[PDB]
Amino acid sequence: SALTQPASVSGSPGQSISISCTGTSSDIGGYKYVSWYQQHPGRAPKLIIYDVIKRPSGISDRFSGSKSANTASLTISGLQAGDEASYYCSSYTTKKTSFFGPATRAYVFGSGTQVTVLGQPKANPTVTLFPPSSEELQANKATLVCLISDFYPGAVTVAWKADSSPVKAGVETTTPSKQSNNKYAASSYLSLTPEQWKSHKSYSCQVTHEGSTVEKTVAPT
Amino acid sequence: QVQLQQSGPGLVKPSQTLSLTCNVYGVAISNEDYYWTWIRQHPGKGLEWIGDIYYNSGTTHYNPSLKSRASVSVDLSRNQFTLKVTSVTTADAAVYYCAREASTKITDDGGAFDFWGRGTMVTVSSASTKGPSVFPLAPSSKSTSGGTAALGCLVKDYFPEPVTVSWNSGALTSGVHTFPAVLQSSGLYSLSSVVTVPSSSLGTQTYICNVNHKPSNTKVDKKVEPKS
Fold this sequence. Notes:
The complex is a heterodimer.
Chain A (H helix, E strand, L loop, with lengths): L7 E4 L5 E6 L11 E6 L6 E4 L13 E6 L2 E6 L9 E11 L6 E7 L3 E5 L8 E5 L3 H5 L3 E10 L5 E6 L2 E3 L3 E3 L3 E2 L5 E9 L1 H5 L4 E7 L2 E7 L3
Parallel strand pairs in A: 1-9
Antiparallel strand pairs in A: 2-6, 3-4, 3-7, 5-6, 7-8, 7-9, 10-11, 11-16, 12-13, 12-17, 14-16, 15-16, 17-18
Chain B lengths: L2 E4 L3 E3 L5 E8 L8 E8 L5 E7 L6 E3 L7 E6 L4 E6 L8 E9 L9 E5 L3 E5 L8 E5 L6 E2 L2 E11 L5 E4 L8 E3 L3 E2 L5 E10 L9 E6 L4 E6 L5
Parallel strand pairs in B: 2-11
Antiparallel strand pairs in B: 1-3, 3-8, 4-5, 4-9, 5-6, 7-8, 9-10, 9-11, 12-14, 13-14, 14-18, 15-19, 16-18, 17-18, 19-20
């Protein structure tokens, strides 16, 4: 029911890129009130185009848009790194509330298109590994915290080791999430007992990312 | 000019009634140029127009998708408007946006949503809420590299999302990083908030994190000192 849109479209810096929004006759094909919304992870949407072509006050000339038949287009020229977000097309439409009766006003949105920028410099993650606090140990809990910030692309591999041997049970690892600076962050958690914590020489957190590996190690002291 | 505040995030039980409020600033709702609209965004999905209201007409309009389970109200004493969705199911859980619909001319049927709100997160679960446990991630020789030192708060065992973490009452903003939460097998969320700071500020300058869990109405203040 939502307007048709490509899940993702990509382009290198400086070049133009086009995002097509396919609709119907009851909207876009019929009405002049098509608009575009930009949404970075994970703030609220912001208006960038309305009435097909017109830009709000404060938007750059880089963002242009057009319409033809039942399809609209958003053309971003002079592409930049900050133009990496989600883009939704919206349109005015009319619908029947009951089976019959006057057609009530409504709005329909698109599925959304993820714009990726090409040729961004790879970044190595800043890794941190916190041991269990005394307070947590007093509560009979124990959680090792492995934090992984500011890496690019958003592909990383985390592993946990007890002393020198790997461990799979008790491991909870977040999926990478986009930061404002277009880099990715993530975190991992190893839940143990105070017994496992105090009955081992060291615990380690390995982070593998594009040929680079980083192993951080904590110990019970 | 326009500024829209939504109510705090929340848990709502199945088959109960969701109710969200939106405070408008910088422009009157009684205005004639603007329809006032509700839109939700489901987790990992596109947007969905819920319904709107136009004051001068007094007419409200809704999306047939909600089977007439949604109603929009207005309160001029505070210049606010509210949404009410009844008999909620798991499919109504989402991030709810409130927006102003503005046209080019009154003659124009439609327009676009120029101004939006930050969004309130609404989770639909019969399970009860739970305030977070706040453990101090203390600075040490481990969370250090030369002139910089990382200290944080572990916000463990809480439900539902979200949680607002700050440091020193929203004063220290330089170097703060809050990671998204893990979803444990138990269903409870957990996240860490770490601030990176100078090394020569651990003994003297104090660091207090402030955790706010609105869904369960919990607010915790924790000081993170160097271990001793």
